[PDB]
Subunit: 93 residues, 2 copies
């Protein structure tokens, strides 16, 4: 009937969003393990740099300088974002 169809439509539309809210509210493991990757990688470029210096290998050194910029930029955006998803990007990807 018309009220029946409308409510069922309302139910289907809203509950589709339900799986997303459950994953966002959920207590999750790796907060900063994704951050830890960056930290680990950061330590790696530092040693790579020292390695490049000791052998006077400029291509290695230049690459790591650029790589150091990249990880630092990424690592500054990770630390900058603040405990909220902030986008509906979760819904789709």
């Amino acid at each position: 009937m018309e009220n029946l169809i409308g409510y069922v439509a309302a139910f289907l539309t809203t509950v589709s969003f339900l799986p997303a809210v459950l994953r966002v509210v959920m207590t999750k493991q790796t907060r900063d393990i994704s951050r830890n990757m960056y930290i680990m990688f950061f330590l790696g470029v530092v040693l790579w740099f020292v390695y490049g210096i000791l052998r006077s290998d400029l291509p290695i050194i230049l690459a790591n300088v650029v790589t150091l910029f990249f990880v630092t930029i990424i690592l500054y955006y990770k630390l900058t974002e603040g405990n909220q998803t902030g986008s509906l990007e979760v819904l789709f990807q």
Copy 2:
């Protein structure tokens, strides 16, 4: 000159990752868009609410307010721990 090989190798390896670094940077722009979107979506729901009353349409009102609840949860629920 093989340092040239080194530079070209160094160039190719790092710059390949460049688009990735740009998408990480772009994630801030899209939060600022999403906050404008939420305000936009919010205003839409109040009008839907007003519209629903005038047309005696409860399902419309229920659907949009509940959807608003969820979207608010998704976009601003402080993640635990």
